[PDB]
Design a protein that fits this description.
The PDB classes it as hydrolase (glucosidase). The entry lists the keywords hydrolase (glucosidase). The assembly is dimeric. The entry is titled "crystal structure of endo-beta-N-acetylglucosaminidase H at 1.9 angstroms resolution: active site geometry and substrate recognition". Chains A, B: endo-beta-N-acetylglucosaminidase H, endo H. 2 copies of one chain form a homodimer. In chain A, strand 13, helix 7 and strand 14 form a beta-alpha-beta unit. The first copy, chain A, is about 30% helix and about 25% strand. In chain A, strands 1, 3, 4, 5, 6, 7, 10, 11, 12, 13 and 14 form an 11-stranded mixed sheet that branches. A two-stranded antiparallel sheet of chain A has the order 2-15. Chain A has one domain: TIM Barrel (Alpha-Beta Barrel), CATH 3.20.20. The two termini of chain A are about 20 Å apart. By secondary structure, the first copy, chain A, is of the alpha/beta class. Chain A is globular. In chain A, about 50% of the residues are buried. At the A-B interface, loops of A face loops of B.
Chain lengths: ~260, ~260
């Protein structure tokens, strides 16, 4: 198995994390997917105390509580498992924590969950935060820097990634500190398109291609996988693998990334 | 019961539409809520044929199929029931239909569902469409105008509303036709804030206030309800009523809108 790291996002409200493990390379026998992401936990906002807090809906909680059966098998098979976090429409986002302390306390919340559930990392998706809702503040220039810096420190050995989207994505440097090097991956959030993330990570850690399995055309899936290889990028983001027979969709990119079609079990 | 029309959005993936009916005015005995919205159906995109189509997840389908038990009781009690539609991250939105025909065919899809399930109208939420995803086109100036014009015609007697947000919201006039007068309501999409929609509807048809039940502070819920009355607006948007005991949250706005506290049954 030689080739770009492929990622699979799974919407746990509707599908099992286990499906990520059913796809292997017909030739290699290796995993078709290298990283699986639990989509997604939330950053809620308590209007009473004006504080953000981490929240798991019952579906996310359910998979976490069943790590032995929902996550362990993936990890034993070699697949890393991250927990994605996104701001709801409550007004709290990754770019509007009022201070290092506010930012640091939430970082601690993320670490304690990773440690507790034995996850391999955290993924940031500043997509629907809706800054200003419920009296929250608009983005500032230090919130994200404080957040990431604190998170990297709490867990120096785990993966921290981010979708290249939203306010937070463009606020990577505050004062004289740039947190770009603190991330392990960055991916294009626009499915079915090619868009090189503007963040300073080496090509091996970037995913300009993004596809939605079962939605984006197979021809487009294959062209973006080929383009990833041609241009020398080392990551290929995939989104929304469900429980149906997606073998053709998967093969569309494994042929290009690893010169092998895929097989479902 | 005299006062602004209050609206309740219910996320059917997690809660019953029926809860909207459990709240009545302690004094009046009238409904605490006048309009209930099923949140939400989707506008999907078929990349094979490059056409948008209406999609109901199993939860939305489940409530529609059970109209006799999930919707009828609300309507018999006097509550109107709308179906909200939103563009996924598939690339198809209300502002990017390639022609009157494309726009008209989807309008027909919405009408046939309203007619089939005996709904009282459609609500447009151009919030997460992600124009350009999967090869779709960016917004244009006629898509929405064609869409609404066609929809109003198919169902001249039903409610058509929209959240004041996204590309579509600002593309209300194409050529010499303005569709603002074709809408019955327009609401602020930003929870916990006051923001008068910029669309040309009379105050009686506008909701500058928007709150999320159980999230936005009760004091803010009460202040925005009072402000609605002070300034003479006739609608008050509420979002995400669940199955818990939200009596205090509800009363926070009924006291202001109708001079009565609410009661749950």
């Amino acid at each position: 198995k030689q080739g770009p790291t492929s990622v699979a996002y799974v919407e746990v409200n509707n599908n099992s994390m286990l499906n990520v493990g059913k796809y292997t390379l017909a030739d290699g026998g290796g995993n078709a997917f290298d990283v699986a992401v639990i989509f997604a936990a939330n950053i809620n906002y308590d209007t009473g105390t004006k504080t953000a807090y981490l929240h798991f809906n019952e579906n996310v909680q359910r998979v976490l509580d069943n790590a032995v059966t929902q996550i362990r098998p993936l990890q034993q098979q070699g697949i890393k498992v991250l927990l994605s976090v996104l701001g709801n429409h409550q007004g709290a986002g990754f770019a509007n924590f009022p201070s290092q302390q506010a930012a640091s306390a939430f970082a601690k919340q993320l670490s304690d969950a990773v440690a507790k559930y034995g996850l391999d990392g955290v993924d940031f998706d500043d997509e629907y935060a809706e800054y200003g809702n419920n009296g929250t503040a608009q983005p500032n220039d230090s919130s994200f820097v404080h957040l990431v810096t604190a998170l990297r420190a709490n867990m120096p050995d785990k993966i921290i990634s981010l979708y290249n989207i939203g306010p937070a994505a463009s606020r990577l440097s505050y004062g004289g500190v740039d947190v770009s090097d603190k991330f392990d991956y960055a991916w294009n959030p626009y499915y079915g398109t090619w868009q090189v993330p503007g963040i300073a990570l080496p090509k091996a850690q970037l995913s300009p291609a993004a596809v939605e399995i079962g939605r984006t055309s197979r021809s487009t899936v294959a062209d973006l996988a080929r383009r990833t290889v041609d241009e020398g990028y080392g990551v290929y983001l995939t989104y929304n693998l469900d429980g149906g027979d997606r073998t053709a969709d998967v093969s569309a990119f494994t042929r290009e990334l690893y010169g092998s079609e895929a097989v479902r079990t």
